[PDB]
Amino acid sequence: ISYAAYLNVAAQAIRSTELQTASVLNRSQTDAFYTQYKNASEPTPITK
Amino acid sequence: ATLKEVEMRLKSIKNIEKITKTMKIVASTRLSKAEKAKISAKKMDEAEQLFYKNAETKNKELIVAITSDKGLCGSIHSQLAKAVRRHLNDQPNADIVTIGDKIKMQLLRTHPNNIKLSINGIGKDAPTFQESALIADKLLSVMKAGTYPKISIFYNDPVSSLSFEPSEKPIFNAKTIEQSPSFGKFEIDTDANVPRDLFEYTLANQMLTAMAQGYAAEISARRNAMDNASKNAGDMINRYSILYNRTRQAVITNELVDIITGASS
Amino acid sequence: AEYFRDEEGQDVLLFIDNIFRFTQAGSEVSALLGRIPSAVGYQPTLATDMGLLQERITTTKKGSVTSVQAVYVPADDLTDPAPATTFAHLDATTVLSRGISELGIYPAVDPLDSKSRLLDAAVVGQEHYDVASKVQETLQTYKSLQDIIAILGMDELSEQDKLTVERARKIQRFLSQPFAVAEVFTGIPGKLVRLKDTVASFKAVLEGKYDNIPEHAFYMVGGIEDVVAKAEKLAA
Incomplete structure (x- = not known):
């Protein structure tokens, strides 16, 4: 866990009063997954 | 033939321009x-x-x-x-x-x-x-x-x-x-x-x-x-258009040649 | 014209309007006599008619008739037997167009479809030829140079590149020359400019003696003498 991960998670948890604009809400989520790779072949993606 | 093979390929270039156009906007x-x-x-x-x-x-x-x-x-x-x-x-x-x-x-x-x-x-x-x-x-x-x-x-x-x-x-x-x-x-x-x-x-x-x-x-x-693609397609539209057109002029000329020979008969 | 030349030794200039309407008239004149018009629907007696016409215009030791003619094509078709056959006889070609005319440019002669077969290095001198070739080269590069600058950025021109721009765009303006008849098209009464002042102007713009003077101060005047007036007013 990066510092910026930790604090990100803080930002996110708070989006669990919804008094804010739409870009703000977007920034705290993403659909992105990361394809893991071996040192060629690819181990299965785990959600980012 | 010649005519049609110019004409279909030209359509390809025209569709490509439309797709590159839309995508660039x-x-x-x-x-x-x-x-x-x-x-x-x-x-x-x-x-x-x-x-x-x-x-x-x-x-x-x-x-x-x-x-x-x-x-x-x-x-x-x-x-x-x-x-x-x-x-x-x-x-x-x-x-x-x-x-x-x-x-x-x-x-x-x-x-x-x-x-x-x-x-x-x-x-x-x-x-x-x-x-x-x-x-x-x-x-x-x-x-x-x-x-x-x-x-x-x-x-x-x-x-x-x-x-x-x-x-x-x-x-x-x-x-x-x-x-x-x-x-x-x-x-x-x-x-x-x-x-x-x-x-x-x-x-x-x-x-x-x-x-x-x-x-x-x-x-x-x-x-x-996407802009540069649209331009390469434009160049290609013009250049194939001429190549088609000359063929039509040849076909009209061949028809007129048949009319000249037929007029002799 | 030829009477003048043969028995009074005169130099004369013979115009024709469309030589297209001479081909088209010629189609008809063949057909009535019984001929079959084949030359893609045009007279078969084509070559001889152009030959008589364009070989009665020559230099005798008395005088010379010379002809400026107007050649127009059937809808911009160059394929056809008629445009090629015409182009064959012509010693030089001067190409005038309406696209050029809408930019407030008279002479509307396009300097990249202005070409001669008498612009050789023996006919006009060594100097004249080199002066024409550098004046030709500047414009030719210029058009290309604008293409990738536009794609890469806005104005990304170098010191080297914009030396070429200055020179090119000053030269485009310098072509102008109002005509009395074309007073209306420039919006400016006519001027009369000569062969010597064509020459003087281009040597100077080349050497950047006329890269001291902005683009608008060449606009609507021709030769060297004329443009002395404009340089003076631009500064004072």
Whole structure:
């Protein structure tokens, strides 16, 4: 866990009063997954 | 025949122009979101940069590269790659993390080994804090980012919103904080592990900046590609149109030749 | 014209309007006599008719008739037997167009479809030829140079590149020359400019003696003498 991960998670948890604009809400989520790779072949993606 | 083979191929070029046209209009919309996002990112970054000068900028390596998952962006995919590969001469066994499907392809070929981590979801979801933060976290455990003395980022700088220049910068290592005066010029007692938090925070803030600047240089090159495609298709429309037309004139002439011979009969 | 030349030794200039309407009239004149018009629907007696016409215009030791003619094509078709056959006889070609005319340019002669087979290095001198070739070259590069600058950025011109721009665009203006008859088209009464002042102007613009003077101060005047007036007013 990066510092910026930790604090990100803080930002996110708070989006669990919804008094804010739409870009703000977007920034705290993403659909992105990361394809893991071996040192060629690819181990299965785990959600980012 | 001749006639019809001109005529169908011409349709292909015409459909292609329409597709490249539509796509370029759409590029212009994306470039604006890409720029707004870049400003805010770059400004956040600037505040750590004030610091890094005064600290003294100082000093296996890691390579990061920045692309969208979508293609048609001209030669961004491979020019950026070409600069990744040039610095692949300074160490063969360097671990390359490819951010976007398109840059992944060119680096995979030169060494399959160096692809260790790669990122899906750049094209659906624009550069934003969530991506960069999760990607900064995984770097530290998977890639041995922290225990590396070298980390460098490659991207495409959006010098202006109609241009792209490929550029590199360093992502200021925890080794850099340690051995630059900034436990001696910048104060903390022992109240926090300032290297292990500051590094991790500027891993992401710099990276976000590289992501937003790249998305903007790229989309800007893509508008250019899509424009240039539309022009190559236009040249081709005109040039095949003439080639068809002369054939019709030959056919009219042959019909008139039949009328001349038939008139003799 | 020829009477003048043969027995009074005079130099004369013979116009024709469309030589297209001479081909088209010629189609008809063949057909009535019984001939089959084949030349893609045009007279078969084509070659001889052009030959008589364009070989009665020559230099005798008395005088010379010379002809300026207007050649127009059937809807811009160059494929056809008629445009090629015409182009064959012509010693030089001067190409005038309406696209050029809308930019407030008289002579509207396009300097990249202005070409001669008498612009050789023996016919007009060594100097004249070199002066024409550098004046030709500047424009030719210029058009190309604008293409990739536009794609790369806005104005990304170098010191080297914009030396070429200055020179090119000053030269485009310098072509102008109002005509009394074309008073209305320039919006400016006529001027009369000569062969010597064509020459003087281009040597000077080449050497950047006329890269001291902006683009608008060549606009609506021709030769060297004329443009002395304009340089003076531009400064004072």
